[PDB]
Design a binder for this molecule. Structure first.
Ligand code: NA
Ligand code: NA
Ligand code: NA
Lengths: 536, 179, 536, 536
């Protein structure tokens, strides 16, 4: 019955506004050295009158603590095709959903509403192993009396020191046009470049080690201001020249941030493999297409442009030392019938750019086995087939699959999401790709949206709430979300397995059978980490 | 564990999206003659896949029924200076709140979400006193199979006939600038 | 804010009167076939006025449900030497404690007071595997309106069928004088015999498979009406005759109830190993000692009696086919100094009864390594030492040890207690012994007590609340307690591990390190059973 | 996280065992001179092991401090018909309740259990106004280290000196049979007279200025040893003689203790007004009725006895100078239908005792307006009606009314109870009556009880916990309770209002509207007293 409740809680449990108060005061955490670890400080006012509340740490200076506030976004409906066993928030949703993380340490406490701060700890490589403790102080007012409570946090620091992940690469298709739309700035202006640096820095600090370049704008939809980072001009009919200066700046920036791998945009448009890319040239204030919207992939015009572009790309790659460090795309998901479309396109590349190896989403194993692509990217629900053929591959996931399958949605429970990197490791994926880092705007339209009130690009239920974006637009760059912090900590768990020498075949991982059939409790994660980290 | 729940409920109880399904089938109302009276037809899908649902009356023509859909608005916080004893929605708010009434009789039923239609009855002065009953029909799909349920409403109509209110005046400061 | 709250809850969480209402409606359980499983139906009136409430099942006929009401007893203080981390009821105790189970399905609901019914399910061996569901109905009154609520229970019934436990034996020193004192009847009259059958049947249905015979009364204190089941008469000085008829009736009874193993009383009195047992002979209305209270264990008198008694015992055991099915005791816990006492007594037994093998509480490993006894019974806090010596042994526990250690007290959390059989199994105990099944009276005095208001035999804090008794005296036999149902279900979990073929060395049990260092959450129990039972 | 917490707390806040530790060190009180004031010294061990703790004062000699220990009694349920807004102990009860005050200053501190001592200060008339301070010392052990803490108490002493209360009379129906039953002594033996003097002295030291004489035993139930202080013997049929010696001793005693006012037993039995009193005459070892249990109030036999008794009563009253200082009773609460019963009885008295004026519980205002009684005693919930008639009257309360209404129950908040004298004063009661000072035994039966474990005379919920008794049986007289000290301090506040000259109409009291609608916070009491006392 206390006027104000405050408790500690782990990073794998959502707190909904109408959650009941808990009592805690004490939390123990575990961490490898050179790693990052998270927890929540929850609070619920039992007072008619609103008040202020402040979160702070004491004695945590060596862990460079970071204190943020968990904001809520509206979730209108549960995502479809998800059984209740696989939904988070049963009893609480549809309703307010915790997700964005805001950089404040003081907020207003509202009557009878459970909220939380999110605290991020940096465990340095040099820290002495064993137990390190600190305190969290919560301060508020009851009338004119000042009140406070201390809570006790313990981190049991393993001897294990994490090494950089190897032979596993992660890419997200971040969107320059989303920055242009949500912040209302000219594409490639200097504000655009700050926001882009800030995003790429966010990505690499959350485990994404591949920097996407959209040299060609990716959408079928035609934009007035597309994000085409390659500059193209057409002085006389069918003779093109190319200015690489924007891509060159992006590569400089990403290399300064720590990237070594880069990824290039698609070369044929995703209606099957049947259309050519939309490529624009500047004119007046905005951009205009070089050829017809419906131009075919096998056209004379588009192949005449590839005859000139691909060698220029090769010269750029040489000049900037990017051949061995680039991943290339052709086109996405040809069904069986589309196969010959893509075969023709692939042979065209082999003729014009034999140096270029391709990777693409091919979920049909019978047609990724045929060698259509060079490195296939099945959706996770086709992973098993590729594994029985033992074909090496990347995996991706998007609005689907759902129900029992791994995913990253608003209503995917956090422990399930936290299994991502364990599954990546045990099922021996080469890498993971995802389309929806900051796709903040209206699906397939040059029309900004509102990520703080709309989580499915206005396309629910085909687009699941949570699929388009894991970060939110902040005034100077991205705000993280809970999902993104958990996903990042999951890529870290993949580094824990690797650094500790655990083999995918190890019995402690044997219940991870598919991207569908796998343990998904916070306890399995805690117990398995305790074994690994205390063996050391 | 039924795939679709539908029940009846009175006009004095908010139904929140995460409310549990109930069982009803039958509701009795009371009404003076020359008056207006209301109730709700609630529904909760227990299916992963969304489906359509339709609300209609049968045998109610003399009550000129009106069928509307209850919409939700976001309630970010409880209002301050209201103790919990005096709050509606304890355990469900802050959250989605039922309040607007929309003029539709069909909607999409969403997974695991309790919603309702709102039904308005006109009890005419000329009606015979006593029990008048009618049925409500709900129609939806499970896969390609059509499904329905009838529910039973009874109105116990008094001999009292309402007269126009007198010596009591009500005003609201409607706002032309708001339009 | 509902006038009446009713919810479902598991058998591993005490409900205190001032617990907050919950919402539930749905509970899932898991169960092996040929087993028994439990849960609670909780309820809290939010009304000024008291009302009646009734609990019943619907659609459970195949599970022979049993519906009982959880009663409360006073807990005046927490037991000492228990850190708050290890106490149940923090924030609620000292106070009313749920424990006795009464056979009613209707009670009065009192204002703002959270109570619960306790429901028991029988999962028959023949039941079909998979999900079985039923409902619980609660009925009460609000003013003159009848009200009710259905709640939904689902039991996921494993393919596994439990086999009788083997090679693990459990004994409790039930007390006949406790029946005579609490029901005010003559020792060995016919009501005494009904109540003894009821107690022994209770025991075997709770996993206790060894029947204790107090042929000699165990207490140092001299009683006027001792529970000495052997009839002894001394017609001339130092010549004794023996009547086994009461023991023979007890053995018939226990065999009819299912027992095969039996246990005999101590032969030397528990002040070290230095005094002879108090043995009585009838005289007038009650009994009188045969020799002085302080007679020594190595007396001429006592050895002259052992020379006559032990061959009569051997003849009886032969006649009744009980030698190989009997456990025998010498005396308990000699400190180092006392060791020669016990050595001398042991040699006397070797001389007079070489057939008799002995088992006793020896918690000193260096003097159980020396062979003093034949089967040692360390207290659990000495188990580790005995295991590094790898000496086979039983374990016991009593008022101690406490804090982190396994125990069965009023303020021992139920998931901790529920771990008993997991610990017995993984740490490979031969058996478990406990002194306090129904020690209902005043410690070491011929004076009844009141188990419904006194839980430590009037000896706290040396005797812990919950230590003397796990059942309460009912009009026709024992009433069960929550502790007793949980401990029973824990012995059943030992049968689950055995029947499913889980080896003590199995990785799923590797965190069970000692009777002190071991998981104790409801989550661990549930998840580990889910693995075992769904592998099937 | 201190091993032992100690803090100060006011006399208007119950401390429950599971209350959290607080920090204090400093408490200021306010007091009129010639008054008595109280506070608590609380303590909570945060230690696994029990320890001793001792409470004492330093520098308080001029205030004649008294240090006692608050004991707990079991409260099984809340009283019914009390909304939570009006219950003390929300979140802590049902459970252990503080109430008895025991004469010890050292106790055992138990693990994680908040307890308190109760300290009583005497503020002498002669003290200099202004601030007086002293210290409280708490001493305990941690292992073998002795530990202690000083706490600081301040008392702000007003210029106001309290005068003896006037025109306001308080009576409690103390029970001689309760002493006989709970101490197992013969009625009117010499132990009886010690315990009776001790009770009567207790009452007058708590504001009770009227001594009840049960000349006739009050209960309908027939006792073998009734408390009938008038000695009656019947030598021949229908001719009675009277020995007044016990009543005379009782009057001498109460006059020695300070009483001036007395009150006599009922003359008609409380089944309506229809039965005659049970009057007994000695025989052998105990007493026997003079006439039938069911004899009528209007019988010939009983009126023939009143013809003889009432003139003897008058002669005694003259001889002992008691007419102008005595209150008389007829019978309690006739409903409307019973009215003619009581009318007949009243006229009988007018014929046989016209000098006798009567006061009785009549809650029906239309039948106290009719003159049935001379000075009426409505229950508090009928007070309002009697005030709108502006009829002068006494007020009483018992198991009822409840909810918002004033009362003195185990679960009545102490600030609410503390308003009693403020309400008596402002609503201008002539006096207050209560049935349950020391009704310690089983309701309506010659069978002792246990006030330490049963607080409703075994009759809950019809009898509310707390209603039968405000003191507990001590070895040499009553133990006070918290409720009794608070009630006493409330009668003292009535003396403050009187001695300070505050008028019932004074605006500072205007929120006191009814015995239901009235402020009930500690803050209101404190602020209003501060105003009164600092005007001075
Ligand atoms: Na692709
Ligand atoms: Na032994
Ligand atoms: Na009276």
């Amino acid at each position: 019955d206390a006027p104000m409740a405050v408790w500690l809680q782990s990073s794998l449990q959502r707190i909904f506004p109408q959650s009941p108060a808990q009592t805690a005061a004490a939390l123990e955490l575990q961490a490898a050295r050179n790693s990052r670890v998270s927890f929540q400080v929850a609070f619920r006012s039992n007072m008619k009158d609103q008040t202020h509340i402040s979160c702070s740490t004491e004695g945590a200076e060596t862990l460079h603590p970071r204190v943020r506030y968990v904001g809520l976004v509206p979730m209108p409906h549960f995502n479809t095709d998800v059984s209740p066993e696989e939904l988070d928030g049963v009893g609480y949703l549809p309703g307010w959903l915790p997700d964005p993380l805001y950089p404040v340490t003081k907020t207003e406490a509202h009557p009878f509403e459970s909220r939380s701060f999110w605290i991020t700890l940096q465990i340095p490589a040099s820290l002495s192993p064993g137990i390190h403790d600190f305190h969290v102080r919560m301060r508020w007012q009851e009338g004119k009396e000042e009140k406070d409570k201390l809570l006790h946090v313990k981190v049991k620091v393993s001897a294990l020191v994490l090494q950089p992940r190897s032979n596993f690469h992660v890419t997200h298709w971040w969107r320059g046009e989303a920055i242009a739309l949500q912040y209302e700035t000219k594409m490639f202006d200097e504000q655009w470049w700050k926001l882009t640096r800030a995003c790429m820095k966010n990505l690499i600090e959350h485990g994404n080690d591949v920097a996407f370049i959209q040299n060609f704008f990716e959408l079928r939809a035609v934009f007035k201001e597309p994000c085409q980072m390659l500059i193209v001009r057409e002085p006389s009919p069918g003779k093109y020249e190319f200015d690489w200066s924007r891509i060159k700046r992006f590569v400089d920036m990403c290399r300064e941030l720590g990237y070594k791998k880069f990824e290039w945009a698609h070369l044929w448009l995703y209606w099957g493999v049947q259309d050519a890319m939309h490529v624009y040239k500047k004119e007046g204030n905005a951009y205009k297409l070089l050829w017809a919207e419906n131009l075919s992939g096998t056209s004379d015009t588009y192949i005449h442009f590839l005859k000139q572009y691909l060698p220029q790309l090769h010269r750029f790659l040489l000049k900037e030392n990017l051949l061995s460090d680039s991943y290339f795309h052709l086109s996405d998901e040809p069904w069986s019938e589309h196969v010959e479309n893509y075969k023709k396109a692939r042979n065209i590349l082999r003729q014009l750019a034999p140096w270029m190896k391709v990777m693409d989403a091919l979920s049909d194993v019978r047609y990724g086995r045929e060698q259509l692509t060079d490195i296939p990217i099945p959706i996770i629900s086709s992973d098993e087939a590729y594994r029985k053929e033992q074909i090496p591959h990347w995996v991706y996931f998007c609005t689907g699959p759902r129900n029992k399958w791994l995913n990253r949605l608003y209503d995917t429970p956090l422990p399930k999401l936290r299994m991502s990197g364990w599954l990546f490791y045990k099922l021996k994926a080469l890498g993971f790709l995802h389309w929806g880092y900051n796709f903040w705007y209206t699906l397939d339209k040059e029309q900004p949206g509102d990520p703080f009130t709309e989580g499915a690009a206005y396309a629910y239920p085909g687009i699941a709430y949570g699929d388009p974006f894991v970060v939110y637009p902040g005034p100077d760059g991205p705000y993280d979300s809970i999902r993104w912090e958990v996903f990042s900590e999951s890529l870290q768990d993949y580094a824990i397995l690797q650094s500790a020498g655990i083999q995918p075949e190890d019995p402690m991982l044997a219940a991870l059978h598919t991207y569908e059939d796998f343990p998904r409790s916070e306890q399995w994660i805690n117990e398995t980490l305790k074994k690994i980290l205390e063996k050391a």
